[PDB]
Design a protein around this ligand. Structure first.
Ligand SMILES: C=C(c1ccccc1)[C@@]12CC[C@H](NS(N)(=O)=O)[C@@H]1CC(CCCCCCCCCC(=O)O)=C2c1ccccc1
Lengths: 10, 235
């Protein structure tokens, strides 16, 4: 789940 | 007054949901203007709700402290349950049985929405509103709502965590705080705390059934492309 990771790191 | 301090810290994490309401309805007003089934509309509303839920989690005390892998695991273990709990608490806050209130704040007759759903989602909505009724009869307030949200996010059943002890401690702290608050502010309703806790497995069962229903409907090509919703579903 790359979208959730980008959301959590952004 | 009569609120433990931990619960105030948890309340500090609640979003200015008037503004969130406005922004979600603006997003949909804009998207629809550029043929969208009711089911797809609900899917996109849930997608925006999921974005807001992620923003709430990464705003949480304790949660920021976690490695991003742990955050991912917790969020993908509890996103469905958080959605169902938010729906139920919305209905409780508005408390007009025979109607459904959406994340947009829009009220729509339960009749006209249920008419458009299959047997699965109709059963799940009936169960959700039975829970709404019971929680209303217990005077479910916002403090207990956020305590339950944190108990659901920081679940004891999520394995393969690095900092499981942090989640255990958060569970202990929030459980004690909710116990204290509920029994001190509602001596009216002893065993209200145990009842609140008994409602969590039921919300969880509803959440899981709904999650798998939307997963299988997506595999069949009936879930319009919702980025984060579908991403949460696949994993
Ligand atoms: C999890 C939800 C959901 C998300 C996407 C699609 C369907 C449901 C929510 C959770 C809240 C969220 N609200 S929202 N739209 O404002 O984000 C969603 C609205 C809501 C009420 C659904 C009624 C629509 C059904 C008509 C077509 C159904 C076609 C069919 O049968 O195949 C949900 C809810 C699901 C279970 C139990 C209790 C409630």
């Amino acid at each position: 789940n790359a979208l959730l990771r980008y959301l959590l790191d952004k | 007054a009569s609120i433990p301090h931990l619960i105030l810290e948890l309340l500090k994490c609640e979003p200015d949901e008037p503004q969130v309401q406005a922004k979600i309805m603006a997003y949909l007003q804009q998207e629809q203007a550029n043929k969208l089934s009711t089911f797809g509309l609900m899917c996109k509303m849930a997608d925006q709700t999921l974005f807001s839920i992620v923003e709430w989690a990464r705003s949480s005390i304790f949660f920021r402290e976690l490695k991003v892998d742990d955050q991912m695991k917790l969020l993908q273990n509890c996103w469905s349950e958080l959605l169902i709990l938010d729906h139920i608490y919305r209905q409780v806050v508005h408390g007009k049985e025979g109607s459904i209130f959406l994340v947009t704040g829009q009220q729509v007759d339960y009749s006209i929405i249920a008419s458009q759903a299959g047997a699965t989602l109709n059963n799940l909505m009936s169960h959700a509103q039975e829970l709404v009724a019971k929680l209303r009869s217990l005077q479910f307030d916002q403090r207990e709502f956020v305590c339950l949200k944190f108990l659901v996010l920081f679940s004891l059943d999520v394995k393969n965590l690095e900092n499981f002890q942090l989640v255990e401690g958060v569970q202990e702290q929030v459980n004690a705080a909710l116990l204290d608050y509920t029994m001190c502010n509602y001596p009216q309703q002893t065993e209200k705390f145990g009842q609140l806790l008994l409602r969590l497995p039921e919300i969880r069962a509803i959440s899981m059934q709904a999650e798998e229903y939307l997963y299988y409907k997506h595999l069949n090509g009936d879930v319009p492309y919702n980025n984060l919703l579908i991403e949460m579903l696949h994993a």
